[PDB]
Structures are given as structure tokens and as C-alpha cells.
């Protein structure tokens, strides 16, 4: 015997949740990327 497939699907659907730690890590990665882009584009009017 075992659970119903729909029952298992519902349990899994309830269980799924974003990972706060991974979200923070990718968040910091994106922040570093945008800081690098900002300091890189800081020189555009120097070209202008």
C-alpha cells in the first residue's frame, strides 16, 4: 500500500518553498554585479 498520487502531489505542492539562504546568496551576487556595472559606467561622460 501507498499514498494516492494526487495526495502525494498535494503534499509536495504544500511543501515547496523558496530557499531563503540561496535567495540571499544570489541576491548578493546580483548586487555585486550591479555595483561593478555602476563603477564601470561611471566613465561614460568622460568618453562624451
Amino acid at each position: 500500500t501507498f499514498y494516492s498520487p494526487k495526495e502525494i502531489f498535494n503534499r509536495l505542492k504544500d511543501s515547496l518553498v523558496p530557499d531563503t539562504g540561496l535567495v540571499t546568496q544570489v541576491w548578493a551576487d546580483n548586487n555585486t554585479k550591479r555595483m561593478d556595472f555602476l563603477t564601470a559606467m561611471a566613465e561614460i561622460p568622460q568618453t562624451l
Binding site: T24, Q25, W27, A28, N31, T32
Partner: protein, 129 residues
């Protein structure tokens, strides 16, 4: 106990483990086998290459805890290389055990990790009286 890892890239001379929960942490082992000739004796040498990496965001500023401190994540790598003749593995082990204690008294207990070196640190060789 701790979290075991499963190999994710196996090869005859390349096996790499990584933590399923934290895929950043790794442990790589590389073996290079080569035949070397010494005086009237052909020798079968092997070099053991071992790399352990732990990705980690190091210092929490002073002693708080909060969301908007997600400081950069840095790396901590420890690489160990062992070379020696295959049949001398019996004595190869003991000096490796000696190498353990030898660096233990300098880094694990000493301040070598900070950057300081202690001339009067107790250092011993593999052989014993």
C-alpha cells in the same frame, strides 16, 4: 557526525565530491602515476593531489544579526600534495602522520594562521629514537 558527500565527477584519475546541500563545498583528489628510473632500479611513482574548498562569508561585523548584511562570500582552500614511491608507502604513511603533528604544533596550536612564525616551535622528524 557530519554531512557526507557523493561523487559528482568520477574518472580513473579524477574524483570530485560535493555537498548536496551546499554544492559550493568540494573535495577533489587527483592521482598521477608515472614510472621513474633510479640507479639500477625502475621505480613506480605516484603523486597524490588533494584539494579541499569551503566557500564561506567570513566575518560578521561586531556582534549583531540582521537581514541587510549579506557580505561577500569568500573561499577557504586547503591543498595537499603527496609524492613518493609506491612500495615505500609503509614508511610514506608515518612521515605523513609526522607531517600532521608537525604542522599541528605550528598552525593548529600556533599563530601561524595569523601570519606569525615561531622560531622556537617544536618540530620533529619522522624517525624516532
Amino acid at each position: 557526525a557530519n554531512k557526507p558527500m557523493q561523487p559528482i565527477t568520477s574518472t580513473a584519475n579524477k574524483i570530485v565530491w560535493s555537498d548536496p546541500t551546499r554544492l559550493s563545498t568540494t573535495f577533489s583528489a587527483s592521482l598521477l602515476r608515472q614510472r621513474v628510473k633510479v640507479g639500477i632500479a625502475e621505480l613506480n611513482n605516484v603523486s597524490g593531489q588533494y584539494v579541499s574548498v569551503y566557500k564561506r562569508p567570513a566575518p560578521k561585523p561586531e556582534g549583531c544579526a540582521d537581514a541587510c548584511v549579506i557580505m561577500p562570500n569568500e573561499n577557504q582552500s586547503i591543498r595537499t600534495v603527496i609524492s613518493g614511491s609506491a612500495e615505500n608507502l609503509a614508511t610514506l604513511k608515518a612521515e605523513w602522520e609526522t607531517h600532521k603533528r608537525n604542522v599541528d604544533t605550528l598552525f593548529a596550536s600556533g599563530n601561524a594562521g595569523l601570519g606569525f612564525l615561531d622560531p622556537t616551535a617544536a618540530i620533529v622528524s619522522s624517525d624516532t629514537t
